[PDB]
Amino acid sequence: PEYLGLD
Amino acid sequence: VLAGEFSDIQACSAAWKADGCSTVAGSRPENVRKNRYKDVLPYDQTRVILSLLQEEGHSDYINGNFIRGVDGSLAYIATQGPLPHTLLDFWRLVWEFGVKVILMACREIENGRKRCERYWAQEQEPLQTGLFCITLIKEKWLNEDIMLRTLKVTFQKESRSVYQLQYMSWPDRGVPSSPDHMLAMVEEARRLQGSGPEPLCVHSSAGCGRTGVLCTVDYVRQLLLTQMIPPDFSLFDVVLKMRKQRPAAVQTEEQYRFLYHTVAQMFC
């Protein structure tokens, strides 16, 4: 449910 | 160098969040379900506030932010790909602000997951969202990577034309399959937009990376076509200001590098 995990 | 610059950009974003770029509206219990992703909320300071149907008690909330253009006007709306239950809010946004062109940088399905709801069309298949009636007037390919749909939108006895351009092959976190086709997208958006102060509506799935790349490319193209370049013009400054208005506008080092090469090419 996250989009900015790696950012 | 570019990797150092982008890292500096991320440090500043981190600092803004620690300092308190606020996100109160997006965090309201009445609004949480209207966010596609728990980690992407619009900044209060630049968020899009919906007053259409206010009198009926409709909420002002949509996950989206205004981004200022070269002339300092509110030139873009950067927003997420609408959810099944925020399609009506998406259209409220398009209608309230007199949007003529919508740029979509994502697909409905990516990596097997649903990333954006269809809010348009289709052929002989009108879409009713609340008091809005959307009809497909015509569609065609601008080029192999981009569909151009001409929509008729009807609300409270009034009818408008709205154009949608959808880029088919640009993955999140990355760059478009065809950089020339992206520029053709922006060029055609501007032709359809014509003169007129209405903002372009730009969205991806989250309304971050691909959305910010598009806005930035248009921003610099507009600068190149309409104004004298400041003698201290800096892509670092531009992207930083973008991120200050919409979270993770330009999400990735890869995209930042893409931006630099594209901008240098545009300058020539």
Curated annotation (Swiss-Prot), chain B:
The keyword Hydrolase applies. It is found in: Nucleus; Cytoplasm. GO terms for biological process: blastocyst formation; negative regulation of ERBB signaling pathway; protein dephosphorylation. Keywords: Cytoplasm, Hydrolase, Nucleus, Phosphoprotein, Protein phosphatase. It catalyses: O-phospho-L-tyrosyl-[protein] + H2O = L-tyrosyl-[protein] + phosphate. GO terms for molecular function: non-membrane spanning protein tyrosine phosphatase activity; protein tyrosine phosphatase activity. It is an enzyme of class 3 (hydrolase). The active site is at S204 (phosphocysteine intermediate). The keyword Hydrolase applies. Expressed in brain, colon and several tumor-derived cell lines. It comes from the Eukaryota. One of its GO terms (cellular component) is cytosol. Its EC number is 3.1.3.48. Interacts with PSTPIP1. This is Tyrosine-protein phosphatase non-receptor type 18. It comes from Homo sapiens.
